[PDB]
């Protein structure tokens, strides 16, 4: 006669399992593990240890609201000597005293999510059942059987574990790297991501089906990308582009994904006020990285966006080169999306790798929606039949622009524009370093190459001796007066008298032109034979301050007209006005669970004073909460603003401290500092 087995306590070995499963930061009060990999379990009994002869143990796991084995959401498996032939297995590793050391294995295609683990202990016809605990199962980039497997440890670290990174903005001529705190492993973020999955429309429709289809990185990526902005009602972010963000946080102000997700969850999942394309991409990247899908934020300069996948874009301009069309959509200065790493069994073989996910809703036949995961290689090959919006992503980097100047007869003359090529300087943060990696080659083959022609035919694409370009003498700062030049080259014997029209206007990052901040018109301009000419245009801070966006972008337009042959030359350039540098000083010795002081300062570059000055500091591993300091007194024209923020780093290793500066006339100024936290000792 055998006494019933009595479970004192079940230990889920958070420390060891977190270290093995690369989820150590995630393992706070719950257990977090990655699928396709075994994890330790320890059972403590009072009185007697488990008897293989007299005791029978079966484990059960459930994840959905409607768990099913068929759907893959529920599994029951028995204790065994060696690993058995089954997706879910439990095997004895060691037995000592009253403790049983087990290893539990999950299939590499198990659906991700929160699971309840139950044990049915049957002893001599008397059956009892316990709930051992809960655990969250995530995608495993380390597991070769997993669809998201990455062979390189460096890439796994960068695309899954690294909580800070860069978003590339500015201009193609002047690329800017904005620090961002993804903070995927910050407190509560994993639960918020699970809520984001649980409140998505497909879950509302079926729930059991949605939880079952969470086994797929494609499905989860699509759901998350839609949830960021596209989903009405339960969307994470609300997008605004008119430069009026007073009632919310301006899109440029954000320094991390964490605050956005926290505001969204804390307010009953109402859309957090004001984000733009890079904000959508950054939040999506945070969610995917938290879920274990390797993801990176990507920036494309001169992006042909919201053109309904049109590969030939035509603009009709007046005598000054101004684009007349009220219908037409401008070429974005830059557009951001994400790339996620996965196999694609739903497609023909050979399309595993980076998949482009654009969480910014785009106009399409059948409505406005984000563009689902499409293999980047398919876009490169021109294989637009490939599933999930290959035509839109392809148009993004390969569209052609034709510029027309309208005649007095009502006819249009095609101008020569060599300044503009769409799909420029596609950039992403490099692996394990702060340098920028150019990934344009992944999207497109070299121009005028055999492969390019090959791809264009598969994509059914295949579309006076004077030159002009816009020149910047040197870097120009926000708040100052500077000159730009129209540089004309006449490499011909002819002498020309031409028309030069120069217009400088403030512009948003998505191409919305504001009023002109500088103009010069020269009706009779002599261009000597075999010579060059520089015509200056003066841009004044007073002229651009009122309508300048937080992107600090100004567009320069030059139209050169040669009347005799009636030839039109067009040159356009986007200028980025440099913000003042934020000086960061780290005071004390950076050690875990020890006080650290960050001194942040900047010098006012404006001729006028600054009011409402605020410093905001954020950083996963450096501070648990965002920190804000307001400077009560105004900062006059030449003075410096300096404040000290107290930080309590809770994690060892390298972390990036992200800083934002806000003021009435100087907004969204960014700074960052790499801080390595040593052992507490
Ligand atoms: N702040 C700022 N600096 C820039 C910008 N464009 C270029 N610069 C910097 O100013 C200098 C100008 O370099 P380029 O613009 O590439 O060259 P350019 O003066 O236009 O003349 P070309 O080389 O003939 O085209 C370099 O030091 C650039 O880093 C811009 O938009 N903003």
XYZ file of C-alpha atoms in Angstrom, residues 297-657:
361
model
C 14.451 48.930 -38.015
C 15.259 49.993 -41.582
C 15.311 53.443 -43.186
C 14.919 54.124 -46.909
C 15.769 57.594 -48.200
C 13.841 59.090 -51.119
C 11.089 56.574 -50.431
C 8.255 56.379 -52.983
C 5.503 55.862 -50.438
C 1.702 55.972 -50.688
C 1.860 55.894 -54.495
C -0.366 52.783 -54.698
C 2.690 50.821 -55.955
C 2.976 53.030 -59.046
C 6.394 52.625 -60.671
C 6.120 55.782 -62.781
C 5.383 58.935 -60.789
C 4.778 62.130 -62.709
C 4.885 65.684 -61.395
C 3.761 68.733 -63.330
C 5.494 71.951 -62.359
C 5.047 75.601 -63.161
C 7.600 78.046 -64.551
C 9.372 78.147 -61.169
C 9.608 74.357 -60.872
C 6.922 74.214 -58.170
C 4.862 71.025 -58.187
C 1.344 72.155 -59.119
C -0.557 68.967 -58.408
C -2.844 69.012 -55.400
C -3.645 65.381 -56.186
C -0.045 64.171 -56.272
C 1.796 62.494 -53.399
C 5.309 63.701 -52.671
C 8.378 61.500 -52.460
C 9.177 60.980 -48.797
C 12.542 62.259 -47.616
C 12.814 58.957 -45.747
C 10.460 56.163 -44.705
C 10.986 53.496 -42.070
C 9.879 49.887 -41.717
C 11.191 46.704 -40.098
C 12.830 43.482 -41.219
C 12.220 40.204 -39.408
C 14.207 36.989 -39.773
C 12.293 33.825 -40.591
C 11.737 30.922 -42.918
C 8.666 31.105 -45.147
C 7.122 27.639 -45.627
C 4.050 29.320 -47.153
C 6.164 30.304 -50.180
C 8.386 28.582 -52.703
C 11.680 27.411 -51.160
C 14.674 29.727 -51.012
C 12.854 32.793 -49.641
C 13.994 32.362 -46.033
C 15.682 35.361 -44.487
C 14.771 38.992 -43.933
C 11.098 39.849 -44.472
C 10.020 43.466 -44.864
C 7.127 44.507 -42.606
C 5.825 48.031 -43.022
C 3.527 48.948 -40.102
C 2.649 52.303 -41.672
C -0.761 52.010 -43.378
C -0.578 52.579 -47.119
C -3.247 53.261 -49.717
C -4.060 50.185 -51.712
C -6.598 48.635 -53.959
C -9.194 47.565 -51.294
C -8.161 50.191 -48.716
C -5.482 51.520 -46.394
C -3.430 48.840 -44.662
C 0.117 47.976 -43.735
C 2.222 45.811 -46.045
C 2.691 42.259 -44.786
C 5.917 40.255 -44.615
C 7.574 40.030 -48.033
C 11.032 38.483 -48.576
C 13.576 41.212 -49.237
C 15.276 38.867 -51.706
C 12.015 38.622 -53.651
C 11.942 42.416 -53.892
C 15.541 42.362 -55.131
C 14.796 39.717 -57.776
C 11.679 41.581 -58.906
C 9.511 38.550 -58.056
C 6.458 40.632 -57.224
C 4.074 37.674 -57.283
C 5.585 36.705 -53.937
C 3.046 36.936 -51.164
C 2.329 39.958 -48.926
C 2.626 43.243 -50.784
C 5.724 42.740 -52.894
C 4.546 45.460 -55.367
C 4.308 48.176 -52.704
C 7.706 47.473 -51.116
C 9.207 47.232 -54.615
C 7.738 50.590 -55.651
C 9.151 51.985 -52.421
C 12.744 51.497 -53.628
C 12.447 51.317 -57.443
C 9.828 53.847 -58.597
C 10.705 56.231 -61.428
C 10.026 59.968 -61.277
C 9.318 62.136 -64.319
C 9.203 65.882 -63.898
C 7.304 68.040 -66.350
C 7.414 71.824 -66.760
C 4.175 73.210 -68.158
C 4.222 75.343 -71.295
C 2.372 78.482 -72.311
C 0.693 76.344 -75.020
C -0.683 73.931 -72.417
C 1.952 71.330 -73.292
C 4.536 69.815 -70.930
C 8.299 69.569 -71.470
C 10.277 66.835 -69.767
C 13.116 68.153 -67.621
C 16.416 66.512 -66.742
C 16.680 65.748 -63.024
C 19.829 63.924 -61.924
C 19.514 64.935 -58.262
C 16.774 62.392 -57.457
C 16.914 58.599 -57.373
C 14.389 56.847 -55.133
C 15.598 54.101 -52.816
C 18.800 55.668 -51.496
C 21.135 54.771 -48.634
C 18.993 52.046 -47.087
C 20.384 51.964 -43.565
C 20.219 49.892 -40.399
C 22.360 49.652 -37.287
C 25.308 47.302 -37.733
C 25.728 44.196 -35.588
C 27.354 44.832 -32.208
C 28.528 48.301 -33.173
C 27.152 51.828 -33.335
C 28.170 52.297 -36.983
C 25.582 52.410 -39.750
C 25.287 49.487 -42.173
C 24.130 50.222 -45.712
C 21.752 47.491 -46.867
C 20.786 48.985 -50.240
C 22.484 46.061 -51.998
C 20.036 43.644 -50.348
C 17.058 45.489 -51.861
C 18.465 46.314 -55.301
C 21.069 45.073 -57.743
C 23.658 47.506 -59.117
C 22.227 49.945 -61.626
C 22.889 49.117 -65.259
C 23.734 45.523 -64.299
C 22.642 42.255 -65.878
C 20.873 41.232 -62.665
C 19.026 44.569 -62.500
C 17.616 44.121 -66.013
C 16.779 40.519 -65.132
C 14.808 41.649 -62.077
C 13.072 44.499 -63.877
C 11.796 42.227 -66.664
C 10.500 39.809 -64.036
C 8.879 42.846 -62.425
C 7.511 44.160 -65.738
C 9.271 47.430 -64.988
C 11.956 48.360 -67.514
C 11.622 52.039 -67.592
C 22.339 69.750 -73.409
C 25.799 69.242 -71.976
C 24.823 71.219 -68.879
C 24.480 69.894 -65.346
C 23.332 71.443 -62.088
C 23.435 70.390 -58.452
C 22.764 71.921 -55.046
C 25.820 72.447 -52.861
C 26.248 73.041 -49.148
C 29.473 74.752 -48.187
C 29.650 72.914 -44.855
C 27.374 71.710 -42.073
C 24.696 74.250 -41.102
C 23.187 74.457 -37.622
C 19.604 74.930 -36.521
C 19.128 78.520 -35.391
C 21.705 80.084 -37.726
C 21.879 81.782 -41.121
C 23.594 79.891 -43.912
C 24.136 79.779 -47.655
C 23.435 77.073 -50.208
C 24.431 77.204 -53.829
C 23.147 76.240 -57.226
C 26.243 74.937 -59.007
C 25.940 74.850 -62.787
C 28.453 73.146 -65.067
C 28.607 74.062 -68.761
C 31.000 71.634 -70.456
C 30.183 72.858 -73.965
C 31.576 75.375 -76.430
C 28.273 77.273 -76.319
C 27.632 80.391 -74.248
C 24.178 80.399 -72.696
C 21.886 83.010 -71.185
C 19.480 81.172 -68.928
C 16.772 81.458 -66.314
C 17.626 80.287 -62.803
C 14.839 79.950 -60.236
C 15.898 79.103 -56.677
C 13.353 78.287 -53.973
C 13.998 77.100 -50.419
C 11.023 75.896 -48.383
C 10.642 74.101 -45.094
C 9.490 70.505 -45.542
C 8.317 67.645 -43.372
C 10.073 64.289 -43.465
C 7.172 62.848 -45.487
C 7.457 65.587 -48.129
C 4.823 68.154 -47.109
C 6.218 71.485 -48.317
C 5.778 74.611 -46.230
C 6.173 78.234 -47.287
C 9.362 79.440 -48.926
C 12.189 80.473 -46.593
C 14.431 81.749 -49.385
C 14.080 82.749 -53.037
C 16.278 84.048 -55.831
C 15.310 84.504 -59.463
C 17.799 85.376 -62.202
C 16.131 85.902 -65.568
C 19.346 86.642 -67.521
C 22.218 84.454 -66.262
C 25.372 84.148 -68.362
C 26.999 80.714 -68.479
C 30.382 80.957 -70.148
C 31.735 78.119 -72.321
C 33.515 75.265 -70.521
C 32.989 76.886 -67.136
C 31.076 76.576 -63.885
C 28.871 79.012 -61.990
C 27.808 79.180 -58.353
C 24.682 81.144 -57.463
C 24.156 81.605 -53.707
C 20.857 81.446 -51.858
C 20.756 82.798 -48.309
C 18.576 80.946 -45.784
C 17.802 82.976 -42.667
C 16.792 81.570 -39.294
C 14.034 84.181 -39.090
C 12.675 82.987 -42.450
C 12.518 79.260 -41.561
C 11.873 79.285 -37.798
C 8.070 79.604 -37.907
C 7.285 76.600 -40.122
C 10.318 74.358 -39.549
C 9.374 70.841 -38.494
C 11.065 68.839 -35.760
C 12.862 66.924 -38.539
C 14.909 70.091 -39.266
C 14.527 69.649 -43.032
C 14.632 72.352 -45.708
C 14.154 71.620 -49.408
C 16.160 73.561 -51.997
C 14.803 73.687 -55.549
C 16.644 74.961 -58.617
C 15.224 75.227 -62.125
C 17.568 76.228 -64.944
C 16.011 77.068 -68.302
C 17.930 77.378 -71.542
C 15.499 79.275 -73.796
C 17.069 78.698 -77.229
C 16.628 74.917 -77.138
C 13.978 75.230 -74.396
C 15.739 72.740 -72.126
C 14.893 72.417 -68.436
C 17.311 71.331 -65.702
C 16.017 70.480 -62.236
C 18.043 70.119 -59.041
C 16.580 69.474 -55.601
C 18.238 68.773 -52.266
C 17.048 68.186 -48.711
C 19.059 69.897 -45.975
C 19.260 68.784 -42.361
C 19.877 71.524 -39.814
C 22.156 70.217 -37.075
C 20.882 70.383 -33.510
C 23.141 71.394 -30.623
C 25.093 68.507 -29.153
C 23.948 67.215 -25.767
C 26.975 66.859 -23.502
C 26.679 63.858 -21.191
C 28.896 63.223 -18.180
C 28.768 60.072 -16.051
C 29.534 60.740 -12.387
C 30.566 57.999 -9.977
C 31.670 54.479 -10.772
C 29.053 52.630 -12.856
C 28.281 49.524 -10.824
C 25.182 47.377 -10.530
C 22.693 48.490 -7.864
C 24.811 51.564 -7.061
C 23.897 55.212 -7.552
C 24.996 56.802 -10.837
C 24.682 60.473 -11.809
C 24.208 61.693 -15.377
C 24.974 65.340 -16.132
C 23.290 66.513 -19.318
C 23.854 69.934 -20.817
C 23.618 71.892 -24.040
C 24.326 75.394 -25.317
C 21.476 77.424 -26.800
C 22.122 77.883 -30.547
C 19.224 80.303 -31.074
C 19.443 84.114 -31.058
C 16.429 84.129 -28.721
C 15.942 82.645 -25.259
C 14.563 79.186 -24.501
C 11.590 78.625 -22.193
C 10.047 75.497 -20.737
C 13.337 73.624 -21.050
C 13.041 69.952 -20.132
C 15.484 67.034 -20.159
C 14.125 63.491 -20.479
C 16.355 60.468 -19.864
C 15.612 56.806 -20.554
C 17.555 53.558 -20.719
C 16.935 49.846 -20.242
C 19.358 48.542 -17.634
C 20.277 52.061 -16.472
C 16.943 53.300 -15.085
C 13.690 51.511 -14.348
C 11.576 54.577 -15.042
C 11.820 57.494 -17.425
C 13.250 60.592 -15.725
C 12.297 64.220 -16.390
C 13.832 67.491 -15.194
C 12.370 70.931 -15.888
C 14.482 74.097 -15.778
C 12.270 76.883 -14.359
C 14.232 79.888 -15.614
C 14.675 80.778 -19.288
C 17.898 79.982 -21.104
C 19.074 83.078 -22.948
C 20.834 83.216 -26.309
C 24.367 82.252 -25.337
C 23.805 80.420 -22.061
C 24.050 76.693 -21.346
C 21.478 74.416 -19.694
C 22.839 71.752 -17.371
C 21.023 69.344 -15.048
C 21.824 66.192 -13.105
C 19.693 63.048 -13.144
C 20.066 60.294 -10.577
C 20.067 56.754 -11.960
C 20.061 53.333 -10.305
C 21.354 50.804 -12.847
C 19.964 47.358 -12.111
C 21.769 45.446 -14.867
C 25.393 44.745 -15.715
C 26.753 45.114 -19.228
C 26.503 47.720 -21.945
C 23.437 49.981 -21.989
C 22.675 53.133 -23.957
C 21.399 56.207 -22.121
